[PDB]
C-alpha cells in the first residue's frame with residue numbers, strides 16, 4: 001500500500017493524527033495515500049524513527065530541521081507550511097539586527113554595545129545572532145551566557161541568569177522571562193532599542209513594521225548587514241542575519257515518500273485545509289494547540305526537489321547554528337576551494353593546487369548547478385561561470401568578483417564578447433527579421449550567447465518563450481528531451497540533448513558544428529567561426545571549411561561577412577566571470593590576482609610549466625581566450641554586472657526555463 005507513517009511527539013498529537021488518518025479514508029480512494037500514526041517521545045526520537053525507517057514524516061522547527069539533516073539521520077525538507085497570503089506565502093522569516101540611524105557602527109563592531117534580545121534560547125533574538133558572533137566571544141566561551149556578558153557591555157536578555165551574569169539583565173533587571181518585562185518578546189526587544197536602552201535589537205524582519213505605523217518613524221532605523229554595511233528596514237531581504245523556514249515537513253533523503261507525502265498533505269489541505277468548514281480542521285485541534293502543524297498555517301507548499309537541507313536553511317543559518325552546536329573557532333585567506341566540473345577540469349585543478357602550494361584546493365561536482373550549490377553552502381569557494389550562470393549564481397546569493405578578459409588589462413570595464421547569428425552564405429533568403437520555421441543551433445539553453453541574448457531579443461517579437469514552436473526543429477542542449485529543439489542534437493544514449501561534452505553540439509564550437517552539419521542558424525560568439533574554420537580546427541567536420549562560406553545576421557535586417565561582427569552583432573555580451581560568496585569577495589579577489597601574475601599571460605610554453613588560461617583539451621576551468629581577470633569596481637551585483645537589459649530579458653525567459661537550482665533559489669527568494 002501507499003501509506004505515510006506520521007510521527008507524533010505527544011498523546012494529544014497522536015489523537016489528532018488518528019482523526020487525520022480516519023477522515024482521509026472518507027475522501028481518498030483506495031487508489032490513494034494513507035496515514036499511519038506513530039507516537040514517539042520527542043522530536044529527536046521522531047527524527048531517529050524516520051531515519052530508522054519506522055516512520056515517514058514529521059514537521060520541524062528550523063533548529064530541528066538542522067539536526068535531522070545531520071548524519072546519521074540525513075533527512076531533508078519536502079513540504080513547507082505557508083502563512084497568510086496565497087499570493088505571498090509566509091514560508092520564511094528573517095532574523096535581523098535593527099539599529100538607530102547614525103548610531104555609527106557595523107555588525108563587526110558590536111563589542112561593548114548594548115544589545116536587546118527577544119529572549120534567551122530564541123532563534124532570531126539569541127541563537128542566530130550569538131551563533132554568528134560566536135567566534136568574537138571572549139574565551140572561554142563556555143558557559144555561553146558568561147562569554148556574551150563579557151562581549152556586550154550590557155544587555156536585556158530575558159530568561160538569562162542575571163544572578164551570575166548581571167550585565168545580561170542590565171537593561172531589564174531580573175531578566176523578566178514573561179510580559180511583565182517590557183523588553184521581553186518581539187515587541188519587547190524592539191522597545192528596548194526604541195526607548196534608547198540598547199544600541200541594537202535582534203528581531204524578526206516584521207517586528208519593526210508591526211510596532212511603527214508611519215514610514216516617517218521607520219526611517220530612524222537601519223539594519224546591520226553581515227557585510228558590515230547598513231540598509232533601510234524595508235530591505236530586510238538583502239540585509240539580514242539569517243533566513244529561517246517556519247515549519248518544515250521532513251523525510252528520508254533517499255527512500256523517503258516525498259511524492260506520496262506531498263500527495264497526502266495536498267489532498268489533506270484540499271478537503272480539510274483553511275476554511276474548508278468540515279468537522280475536521282487540519283490546522284486546528286480541540287485537543288491542544290499547534291498539533292502536527294502550526295494552527296496559524298494557511299496550507300502547504302511542496303519544497304522544490306533540488307533543495308537539500310543546507311540549501312534550505314541557508315549559509316548564514318547553518319553557520320550560526322553550527323557554531324552554537326559544535327563550538328569550534330580558528331588569520332587571513334586560507335586555501336580557495338575551486339569547483340571542477342569534469343575529470344579533465346579536476347586534473348587541471350590538481351596542477352594549479354600544488355603549484356600555489358596549498359593556496360588553491362579542488363572540490364569537484366558533476367554538473368555546474370552542483371558546483372554553484374557547493375559554493376553556496378561553503379563546500380566550495382569559487383568557480384568561473386557563463387553570464388547566464390552568473391545570473392543564476394546571483395539569484396542564489398553568490399556574487400561576481402573577477403571577469404575573464406579576452407582583449408588586451410587588470411582594469412577594464414566592458415571588454416565583453418559579441419552574440420552573433422551565423423548562417424551559411426549560400427542560403428541568401430535568411431535574415432534576422434524572418435527566422436520562423438528554421439532549424440537553429442544553440443550553445444546550450446540559458447547561456448549568454450547561445451540562448452539568453454538571441455532568444456531574449458526574439459521574445460520581443462512573439463511575446464512568449466515557447467521557441468520550439470517558432471523554429472521548426474533544432475539543437476539547444478538542456479531542453480526537454482521530447483522537445484523539437486533536441487531533434488538535431490547528435491548525442492547518443494542518454495547524452496542526446498545533454499548540456500555537457502558528451503553531446504557533440506554542446507557549447508560555442510558544438511552549436512557551430514550543428515550549423516555546419518544540420519542547422520540553418522547558429523547563435524554563438526564572434527570568435528567562434530574564425531577559430532573553427534580554415535584548417536585551424538583539425539577535426540574532419542571543421543577542417544575543410546572557411547569563413548568566406550559563412551555570414552552573420554545584423555539587427556537592421558541585412559547580412560555581412562564573418563568579419564563585420566563589429567556592427568553585425570545581436571548585442572554585446574556580459575563577459576564570463578568568477579563567482580563566490582559575499583564573505584569571500586575579499587579573499588578570492590586577493591588570492592586570484594596573486595595566482596594570476598605567477599601563472600597567467602606572462603609565461604609561455606605551457607608544456608611542463610603551468611598556465612592558467614591554457615587547457616589540455618578545450619577550455620578547462622577558465623576559457624582559453626582569457627588573458628587576465630578584471631577588477632569589477634562597482635559591478636559586483638549580478639544586476640550591476642549583467643546590466644538591467646540582460647536581466648529584463650532573462651526575466652522574460654524564466655517563464656519557460658527548466659533550471660531546478662534556480663527553482664529552489666527562487667523558492668526562498670520569490
Ligand SMILES: *[C@@H]1O[C@H](CO)[C@@H](O)[C@H](O)[C@H]1NC(C)=O
Pocket residue numbers: 407408
Ligand atoms: C580591444 O582593445 C583595443 C585596445 O585599444 C580596442 O581598440 C578595441 O576596440 C577592443 N575591442 C574591440 C571592441 O574591437
Ligand SMILES: [Fe+3]
Pocket residue numbers: 386387447448449576
Ligand atoms: Fe558565454
Ligand SMILES: [N]
Pocket residue numbers: 254255
Ligand atoms: N539509498
Ligand SMILES: [N]
Pocket residue numbers: 254
Ligand atoms: N543513501
Ligand SMILES: [Pt+2]
Pocket residue numbers: 253254255
Ligand atoms: Pt541513498
